[PDB]
Symmetry: C5
Subunit: 341 residues, 5 copies
């Protein structure tokens, strides 16, 4: 009760920040087109990024660490002022230091921070490339199935097989994104009895891969054609592997706890070394330093698991859009080439 009520009050802003950041990660994202790129590289982008700072998910996550160090600066400033006004006994010293130790270690701090954020950006690029390969693989496999499968007796199996290659990116998205309804997202993509088996499996992408591999065995193909055709599933297994490792295995905790601890120690004694040249300007100085330096580390932490920063619904809808345009256009391209003669 006496000390428990103090911790509960201090546990309000960080709880609000955690709720705000996590709700901001469920936001729907969209593929950039040309007119959105024009808006991106505009003269007003510097004004509009500054005025949208208070609604930014990254800025609102800095509120706990920036407030924490600003009160540390205010307490150091208050104590140093009390010593300067002789309001405390002579035994109490003035908390001041030379900036020279910090001038020797500043480049070490900057290189650690920016390299940690570069490691996070590398894992985002790995995610983006893996999804590029899965979507190009599904497009390539669907294109080849539309051309390869010809027999009138395999029409139902060909239709089923084209439904699973569209459904695989959706299942993989529902595997990598938290709180995703695969049943709703596959309702119009798989058959009612088709989807029941998929919903009953622990590994939904793997299960759909299994339906793909068994359809290729029941098709009436020459063995060379089937071997060529079942070589395209390895793309899906590779995609599952890369996507599961970015979720399972983060950047080593030693490497990221180093950046965390360095930044916390640097802002704890930053008002002490800055006292001689700044006096009460250590409060705004520590506020701006903590906001700037913790923002780099915050950006690194948010993109370290990158699948929520990708337009995976639009990437998945692109494969579905491509197979319809193709099955509609088949009639026309077939009549056009018949005419060449």
């Amino acid at each position: 009760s006496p000390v428990q009520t103090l911790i509960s009050i201090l546990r309000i802003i960080p709880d609000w920040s955690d709720r705000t950041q996590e709700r901001g990660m469920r936001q729907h994202r969209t593929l950039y087109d040309h007119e959105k790129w024009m808006h991106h590289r505009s003269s007003y982008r510097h004004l509009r990024h500054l005025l949208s700072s208070l609604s930014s998910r990254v800025i609102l996550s800095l509120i706990p660490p920036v407030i924490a160090f600003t009160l540390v600066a205010v307490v150091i400033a208050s104590y140093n002022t009390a010593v300067a006004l002789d309001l405390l006994p002579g035994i109490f010293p003035l908390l001041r230091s030379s900036s020279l130790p910090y001038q020797l270690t500043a480049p070490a701090l900057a290189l650690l921070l920016v390299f940690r954020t570069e490691a996070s950006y590398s894992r985002f690029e790995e995610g983006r490339k893996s999804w590029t390969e899965v979507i190009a693989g599904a497009n390539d496999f669907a294109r080849q199935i539309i051309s390869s499968v010809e027999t009138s007796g395999d029409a139902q199996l060909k239709k089923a097989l084209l439904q699973y290659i569209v459904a695989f990116p959706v299942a993989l998205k529902c595997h990598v994104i938290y709180g995703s309804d695969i049943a709703r997202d596959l309702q119009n993509l798989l058959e009612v009895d088709d989807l029941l088996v998929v919903l009953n499996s622990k590994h939904r992408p793997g299960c759909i891969i299994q339906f793909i591999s068994r359809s290729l065995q029941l098709l009436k193909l020459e063995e060379s054609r089937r071997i060529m055709l079942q070589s395209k599933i390895s793309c899906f297994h590779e995609g599952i592997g890369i996507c599961e490792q970015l979720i399972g295995t983060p950047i080593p905790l030693s490497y990221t706890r180093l950046t965390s601890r360095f930044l916390v120690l640097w802002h704890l004694t930053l008002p002490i070394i800055l006292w001689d040249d700044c006096h009460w300007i250590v409060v705004p100085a520590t506020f701006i330093s903590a906001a700037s330096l913790f923002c780099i580390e915050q950006v690194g932490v948010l993109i370290e698991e990158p699948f929520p920063m990708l337009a995976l619904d639009d990437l998945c809808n692109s494969v579905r859009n491509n197979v319809q345009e193709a099955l509609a256009s088949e009639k026309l391209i077939r009549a056009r080439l018949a005419a060449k003669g």
Copy 2:
């Protein structure tokens, strides 16, 4: 009317800058040859880059942010001068600070700026490599079709198939470049009825891939030869995938808004920390700092979507030039090897 007329006047230079930069991105680009490389690595390149600065697209895009911070410096300088001349009441302080907080965070700013521009350059290299692979793939596929297809009954289909492999890089260019007339750029490359189906499809590169895949099924080939031959389409699907992701998915907005916000905050208080050592020299100092530092970020923003910085018309014309030289030379190489005996 009273405040609306002020915003309209302030919305003139950024509108002019946005119009100038966007018109400069439609410029026709050309592949470097040897004598253009000699001009590139000349002693006069430092003079000619400086004298062509006022016509540079990047420099004219810096005019809004550089003017904005130069008037901030002029207002801070005017206020500090009024305090120094005792033209304001004693309550009004002098806006001055120590440079020591900025000396600790300078390397963090420099590393963030230069790493952001390096991320943009990485996406340009990804674009350039993808186009390298698509053009080498189209050259390789065309070379193999000229050698593989022999039957006199497949001459029309072979000619048609060589027309689509030339047309695929042009369709992909017209997919990635804004305001591109595919109908005009494919007028002499595809047949009149051939192009109508392509113009009616939502995915023109995909449609041409579909015409390629169906021609390979109607060719009278051995199945091993056809499987070898239809393995070269995967290059085109990979090219489409990489090109669509560089347009759809930019560098995460957190990562680039960080660099934007850092630079805006750094130049807002830069005249305050520089006042003690510079006085009215904060105006030229802030002008040069804003011009130098915003130019790095501007270069990063312009090459982030890189397909307008590539000579995609010359890369596409190279594939067309190669297939003619080949179909002309076929007669000669065939007679030369017949003679070996």
Copy 3:
């Protein structure tokens, strides 16, 4: 006895640190799920990393080098104080220097330290990717064996072959991790006579690869199917090769001894150059500098051989979990596709 007892006392803290770090490398690690990622990117992560510092394996390994340089600072401070109080003869000078040589070489030290840790992180990413490829390869091979092998006469051999593809990641983990009981970890995965041959071989992963390759020769397959099927073993040979080279071949000893020697020389004379601006504050300054800078190098040394920082038991159990879900679901997917007709 007189000097041997002094070395034994000085050999206590480093022995304790070496025991603590090595016991901390046998810790069981777990794949991150979604709610563990939420905990990772929390507002409290800066507080909880600081309060868990005294139990951190990296921090307890810094105790020997941080104590060593803190007593060096205390001895330099004591000597300089004795000179300032004229307690020593006039011949004895004051150990002071200018910081200007250190201000010119600080960025060289920071770039060396952070690049060494980046080299270590690159070897961790190489390890993580190699295990990604091995697990995706085993999943892909198992999926294809479940579909490819059909003959009722090859049921026993198919079951045996699926047991070795699950067992290969476990043997490779027991090859790369020290003090690993392969006999206990393969007790329920291979047959009793199957495991005796594996336990008698010097290269257990290689031996299991050999059982896989011989099963593929005894299967009643068409030669094209078998060639397609025995192309998936190359993944396992590549995995063995990459995993053995990260253990056998460290980062060149020149490159890492450079960072070691630089840091030792920099902290030996750091209290001498800092004396004029700090006086007795060289003790806390050297303590914090040694703790910060040796922590970067320590993080680099711990992840340089990275296989203990990976959840290799969970990655291995995922392949076993996937093949059961598959052999259970086979009955259902077969009845579902039979029904398409």
Copy 4:
């Protein structure tokens, strides 16, 4: 005449520098062997690099920009001296400034310069790897042709085909190097009528690829063997693609004009900020700064198109040397294996 004669005199040193650098790019280069590596890592390498500075191609290209900024420093110094001696009217001020703006932007300049040179080095490594792949591909293709082709009726065609695989790296070198006589370099490698068709083609590497592909169609091979054999031409198409893109597409002109303009602005006002601490030492200081900083950018510009920095004649002669050693040794290896029995 009055102003034209001044520009002609100022256009002498840059013309001489451009002539010297361009003649130095036609120099014959040689593959390092072991005793040249011993000379490379010698104790005297620091003395011999300094004494060979005046004959260095990079140093003689710095003469125009280093002289230009040294006279700027001399003019600023002369003007500041005239003000200090009161030789000009009181209205004329002293051109001095604080170094603090330059101390905040120094790391930005250094990171831009060194990253630009790293981009140039990346394009050199891309060139070197592409030539590695082409030479290994030609060696691999020649080795397989010597083993695969057996029929006594295909001896003439086999000899012809081995002549084109040796000739392809020479044609690609003559495609990428300026002023290269392909007729002289292929005189002893192709037949007299063979070379006439190659000389008449606009794309000589492509033409030789076409002679290779047509020889493989006229060989009496099984179709599986021919498909295996014509899969090795893709290496040559990839080599042509990568080599043409490094010549056609430089590093984006925005990115390199940034480094150019930054360096020119930094050395223009460098004597003004250095006046208070240096006085006439701004002339040697600006001379050394311009020589050091423009040398980094110069190195970047010279290796940006890297094919003249490679020993392409020695790499091409290695493939020719390997096929002779092989066709000579064939008799011996055939008799050795016949004897195994």
Copy 5:
């Protein structure tokens, strides 16, 4: 005689350093096991690297450049002392300067040095990966030959073919390492008449590749199996290509002479700029700066050609060890799988 005897005395320490470094590159290296990794990441590694500094090959190579700059500092200090004591005429000035030009260029020097050493480390990683691929390729090829070749009539040829795949890594090691006895290292690996042909060839790795390719043509295999089997030689051609290019083509001499010349100019005038703050402490300051900064460049120069820093004998013996364990275990795995039934 008068000036020749002075150069001979100055040519003693660099000759001794060159002899010591070159003898230290022939040292036998060993693959790290687990207990050597424990020794690597110990608390005593900072003490044991410092006490083994005088026997370090890199440190003894710094003796010529560190002594050279320390006498430069001593001469500058002696001259400045003579001026301060008025022992020279008034015309002779005091060699002093401001450190501000060096404070602006320090980060440029540090980034150049550390990036040059990173380029050297990249070439070491390329070498290490190439050897990883060659050893995994030889293991994979040997494993497949043991399974694929079955005919009792091909036992002698199968034994011969397994002897050449073990011998290829040894020949490639004897190709890349200077002063290597291939005759002694292949004495127990090839037949007496087998080795005579290999010793008579100019390209020993190529010759062994030729014996491998001819054995595959004389084996009684199905053509699909042989094509699968002769696809594994491309690994050996790739290995030869990458290994020959790292020896033939160093890092461009412009790029490394830049770092050399920068470091020599920086330490020549370093005692002049440090005189005002250090006086005779420029001698130890220049000694430590030259030792630290030239050590980074020295590490870069020693690993630039990396094949002596690899345990190539242990990597080669691992392939030989693996094929014996396999040919011994064949009997057992064959009886085990026969029993499954």
